[PDB]
Amino acid sequence: FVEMVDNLRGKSGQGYYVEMTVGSPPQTLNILVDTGSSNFAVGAAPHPFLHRYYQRQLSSTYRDLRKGVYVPYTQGKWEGELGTDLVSIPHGPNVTVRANIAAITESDKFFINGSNWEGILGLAYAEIARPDDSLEPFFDSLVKQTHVPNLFSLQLCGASVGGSMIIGGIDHSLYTGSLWYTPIRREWYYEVIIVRVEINGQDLKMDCKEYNYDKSIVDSGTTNLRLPKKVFEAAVKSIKAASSTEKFPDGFWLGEQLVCWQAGTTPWNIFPVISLYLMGEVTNQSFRITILPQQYLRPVEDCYKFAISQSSTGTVMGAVIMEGFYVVFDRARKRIGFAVSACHVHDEFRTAAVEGPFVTLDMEDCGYN
Numbered sequence: 001f002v003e004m005v006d007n008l009r010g011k012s013g014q015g016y017y018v019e020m021t022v023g024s025p026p027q028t029l030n031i032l033v034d035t036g037s038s039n040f041a042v043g044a045a046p047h048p049f050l051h052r053y054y055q056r057q058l059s060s061t062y063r064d065l066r067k068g069v070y071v072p073y074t075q076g077k078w079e080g081e082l083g084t085d086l087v088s089i090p091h092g093p094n095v096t097v098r099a100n101i102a103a104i105t106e107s108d109k110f111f112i113n114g115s116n117w118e119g120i121l122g123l124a125y126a127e128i129a130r131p132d133d134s135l136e137p138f139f140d141s142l143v144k145q146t147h148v149p150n151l152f153s154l155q156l157c158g159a160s161v162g163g164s165m166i167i168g169g170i171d172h173s174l175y176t177g178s179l180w181y182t183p184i185r186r187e188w189y190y191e192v193i194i195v196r197v198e199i200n201g202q203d204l205k206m207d208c209k210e211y212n213y214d215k216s217i218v219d220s221g222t223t224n225l226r227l228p229k230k231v232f233e234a235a236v237k238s239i240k241a242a243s244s245t246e247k248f249p250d251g252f253w254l255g256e257q258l259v260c261w262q263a264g265t266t267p268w269n270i271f272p273v274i275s276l277y278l279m280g281e282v283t284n285q286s287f288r289i290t291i292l293p294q295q296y297l298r299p300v301e302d303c304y305k306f307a308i309s310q311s312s313t314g315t316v317m318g319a320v321i322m323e324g325f326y327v328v329f330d331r332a333r334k335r336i337g338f339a340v341s342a343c344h345v346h347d348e349f350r351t352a353a354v355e356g357p358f359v360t361l362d363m364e365d366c367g368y369n
């Protein structure tokens with residue numbers, strides 16, 4: 001798989017993008033890899049923050065579907081025109097496909113001033129595809145129209161960030177130890193169930209249904225470990241406690257202040273490891289993934305951001321979790337797999353782990369209905 005190794009680039013906080021081409025002749029764009037959504041959507045107008053944008057008038061293989069899409073979200077929108085064209089991924093499988101494409105023609109707080117990407121790649125399922133599930137997501141089209149296997153994996157290494165998106169298989173050189181799989185609970189987002197949370201090998205001891213209220217998902221497009229509300233303060237409370245070897249203001253933990261140290265020495269030890277238990281492949285079986293403080297204390301370009309934060313929408317295992325591990329989205333088998341990443345950052349004392357099996361009863365009761 002070397003061709004696809006290291007095919008991802010980005011900037012701290014600005015996401016991961018892969019190079020893609022659209023239309024005939026090919027028009028190259030940097031597209032952001034997002035497992036949190038299901039639309040393939042790209043800039044078509046000369047927005048001032050865009051380096052490049054899709055010029056449909058140049059493409060003989062462009063086809064208007066004569067329909068629009070409106071995608072509002074919490075603090076922003078994008079809006080555009082549906083059509084189809086031929087899509088290819090240079091540092092990826094050697095194929096070319098006809099995919100749905102949303103020509104973005106108006107947006108608000110969508111493009112990042114500074115960033116170097118011009119569209120988004122929705123890697124999740126039809127159910128959450130805008131405007132409706134009849135709009136076949138890109139990856140569905142790829143597997144349907146070639147012999148590329150129904151799976152992809154992501155190794156986010158994290159100014160310049162890099163990684164790999166291995167379309168069609170798994171590159172063993174990218175991870176150590178063993179993959180452990182958690183089932184994709186439903187095919188809309190990459191929904192999974194967390195069955196237990198420790199902070200310093202010490203159970204948070206909360207009703208496990210809290211952890212997946214209303215949703216726990218895996219999302220390359222989100223930066224933070226975002227936790228649900230109750231869970232969040234409970235973790236904070238425990239994190240706050242394990243970190244009593246020093247004080248910080250309330251606004252910090254709340255993601256309203258930065259927190260400053262001296263570029264002489266990185267402390268680290270006074271911060272707790274976080275363990276998440278995820279439902280295993282078998283009845284009553286689970287496994288745990290373990291992040292270090294390097295994963296959740298993120299330098300801003302010497303003050304870091306506490307990269308765990310609260311949420312209304314559920315749990316979101318963002319880059320914080322994902323850069324710890326090789327993540328395999330085994331869509332063929334309705335499961336997500338986790339292994340200790342080969343490129344993740346680690347000191348000499350502690351390390352990110354994927355360990356099992358453990359015994360965990362009533363795991364299905366941790367889901368929400």
Ligand SMILES: CN(C(=O)CCc1cc2ccccc2nc1N)C1CCCCC1
Pocket residue numbers: 015032034035036037071073120219220221222223
């Ligand atoms: C707020 N953002 C998040 O990723 C949070 C969760 C998320 C929201 C989305 C909203 C609309 C379309 C796709 C989305 N994908 C996501 N993963 C991003 C918006 C898209 C580009 C990067 C910043």
